[PDB]
Design a protein around this ligand. Structure first.
Ligand SMILES: Cc1ncc(COP(=O)(O)O)c(CN[C@@H](CC(=O)O)c2ccccc2)c1O
Ligand SMILES: Cc1ncc(COP(=O)(O)O)c(CN[C@@H](CC(=O)O)c2ccccc2)c1O
Lengths: 431, 431
């Protein structure tokens, strides 16, 4: 499906971006001297070079060349509060007043843990980590240590952190858990794998919607299979809700009425501060009670850091309440529906998939149900879309994902929709 | 070596602590409802229950019962700046002004990376993570992916993070890397292991001084063996300098004139914000250049977060300069020497081991060279010491470790020394 016409368009788009952004280009050359590819977070890199941002307030930011954008990326769902939320700021100020690096417990960690347990229906007890990666690693540590088993079932296209990256199948850098990969949403194939491996299965690890892998919702039949089979064979079902937890007050599990044995959390819950968490069934999580004989150990210098504890409690109780989550997801559904309406109205061979305030463009009108479907959609048009949106002052992920923050308003949503319509018109010959 | 007299003393000490701290006791009972054992960082727990701290400024903090302490723990070496450092505060303010969760690169990450590369002599390129745990996992990911080998040599008593905890040998929660454990400082035994396993050795992972494992310096012969054997067999030598990096401007490697292939960093370098890093030889780290064919992936939501980037650059360039590191280590050496002088003057069967500003008490006058030596020292007296120091308004780790912050001054050092002398006098019958 790769064509020379599209490759020529991409070359032209990259060239225009380069010409537009010489200050960012200068930054990149300098950054390469201290970091591999001038990079410390792989997903931030794109050709010909990434933007460097100077400053941002609310939903807007400005690059080092002075161009302004509305930020539709929202820190891959962590940046729910925009760039300068006054309640987050107040929480940071309160944290400084309590004191940094106090080397001890404060009440703030307990208050934050209570806020998490209150709203997530399957989390009876929780522990905080410093990232979604650590949360998922600790969930696997819990499952393997409790069951004494080695096999982990996960899914092709699934992303669970820097050491558990299955976005393109097995990565040589992944931690060497014995992972068997299924096809997302594939009931019969997955049922077969669970017949074969169920006996040695410590855990099933699954996102209720592929996040990085394309905003691909799980189907109920698929999740029902995993819940029934985990219970049958004695594996722990782990829902990775690092992204999906935002979709309702109680995440995907509240929406579905399906409870995982363990749940991992990340992104926005710490108020935009470093954050992850793992929690779940009381009888599983109690294995970490340090007063218990044979307790599992889980240290971590910054687990209880005052900034995350303070900003996280503010995030859940003062800003993104359960009602706020319902409201934002409804807003996101209307937004996604409008984008899809624009595509249909214009006979465009594209769609936006997702749930609530999360969505990704795919250049296909086939059902998008697994990693294979995402990969089969037109990747060249996806790149062209990214550069087009940038030229229109709209910033979203290179991979075509948006994650609406609470600061996105009518003006931003209107601008996105108009820019989409303009893309369809201007790139008609390639569509 | 356990006696009933010491057990009775411990029971009495725990009872006195409980009576002194009923508000902390009340907090603990509530915390148990949301976190396993009311805990989110295992090392913070101790019997009968841990203190809850209300507030701190500089080197001092106050518990929820109103008692004041000087903080000699210093966040297990991360809390180098005390509780309210004005330069860290200024950096946090600057970070808020730049904007939170900007979803893009800023110049701040490059400036911070430059500061790291400038002072650490074996780090040609660096990438930031969210914890020392992630840094060490990524170092192992790098070594195994580059070499195509599976075996990792590490050491009994070694601590490399929540998924790489060898403090008490193999932990069932550890990530399932194929780890072979040697005895720290054991040249002949380790040489034997490297003859057996060298061919399949992806990495040797070692702290230049056991940190959590007792502030036990590595001997030069031991480190020379590892450097020679890693080079001979093609394994990557990884120095875990998460704690030791503070000991000079260029960490232990500058002090030793031995260069590791990869170095991991953590703790204070991010200004007390969430932080880890892995760096090392250019040709190894370039494998992460995202523009390269077959690049290794290393994402992480908070890797480049503006608070860590800002406070970290301030930490290294405005506060804890290379000269500041030399000065603090010299201060720490004088402090440790004074503690040891007090022990010798009083014929006390105890010593403080360590380097620079890091030290741990051991109730033995035997050489402390490996995990076995630390474990063989009197553990009951160690517990008694912790409670004694608390009663004197001096806070250090339950395990008897201090990590001097830049805010520790004459008054605090004098109080510690006097409290040590008082312990020796008051507990004479047990010594
Ligand atoms: C579903 C999911 N689970 C875990 C993670 C890991 O969380 P941390 O990044 O906090 O360790 C993630 C992270 N998604 C982001 C990470 C980023 O660098 O923004 C990501 C990763 C790869 C591609 C796109 C986005 C999840 O999403
Ligand atoms: C030498 C060393 N390497 C790695 C780590 C892991 O760093 P993170 O805690 O940032 O993931 C550490 C951590 N040491 C502390 C952790 C804490 O919770 O304070 C620790 C752990 C266990 C016992 C005592 C101190 C290293 O020290």
């Amino acid at each position: 499906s790769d064509t020379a016409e599209k490759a020529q368009a991409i070359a032209a788009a990259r060239n225009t971006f380069a010409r537009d952004n010489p200050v960012s280009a200068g930054h990149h050359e300098r950054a390469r001297r201290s970091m591999p590819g001038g990079n410390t977070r792989s997903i931030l890199f794109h050709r010909p070079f990434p933007l460097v941002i100077a400053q941002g307030t609310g939903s807007r930011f400005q690059d080092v060349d002075g161009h302004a954008y509305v930020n539709f990326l929202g820190e891959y769902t962590a940046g729910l509060f925009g760039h300068s939320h006054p309640v987050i700021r107040a929480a940071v100020e309160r944290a400084l007043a309590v004191g940094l690096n106090l080397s001890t417990q404060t009440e703030n960690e307990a208050l934050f843990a209570e806020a998490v347990c209150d709203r997530f229906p399957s989390i009876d007890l929780v522990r905080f980590t410093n990232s979604g990666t650590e949360a998922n690693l600790m969930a696997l540590a819990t499952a393997t240590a409790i069951t004494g088993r080695k096999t982990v079932l996960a899914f092709d296209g699934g992303y669970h952190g820097g050491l558990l990256n299955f976005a393109s199948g097995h990565a040589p850098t992944n931690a060497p858990y014995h992972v068997v990969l299924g096809v997302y949403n594939d009931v019969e194939g997955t049922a077969d794998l669970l017949k074969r491996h169920g006996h040695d299965c410590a855990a099933i690890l699954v996102e209720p919607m592929l996040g990085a892998g394309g905003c691909v919702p799980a189907e109920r039949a698929f999740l029902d299979l995993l819940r029934a089979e985990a219970s049958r064979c004695g594996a722990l079902l782990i829902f990775d809700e690092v992204m999906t937890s935002r979709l309702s007050g109680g995440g995907a599990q509240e929406m579905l009425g399906i409870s995982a044995d363990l749940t991992t959390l990340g992104k926005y819950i710490g108020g935009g501060m470093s954050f992850g968490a793992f929690g779940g069934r009381r009888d599983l999580m109690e294995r970490f009670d340090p007063a218990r004989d044979g307790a599992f150990a889980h240290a971590g210098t910054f687990n209880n850091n005052i900034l995350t504890m303070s900003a996280g409690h503010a995030a859940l109780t003062q800003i993104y309440t359960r009602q706020a989550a319902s409201d934002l997801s409804a807003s996101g559904d209307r937004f996604r529906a409008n984008l899809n309406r624009i595509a249909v109205e214009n006979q465009a061979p594209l769609q936006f998939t997702g749930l609530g305030s999360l969505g990704t463009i795919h250049f296909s009108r086939a059902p998008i149900r697994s990693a294979g479907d995402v990969r089969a959609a037109d990747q060249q048009l996806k790149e062209l879309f990214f550069f087009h949106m940038l030229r229109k002052g709209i910033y979203l992920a290179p991979r075509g994902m948006y994650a609406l923050s609470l600061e996105i308003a009518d003006a931003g949503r209107d601008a996105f929709a108009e820019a989409l319509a303009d893309f369809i018109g201007e790139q008609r010959a390639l569509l």
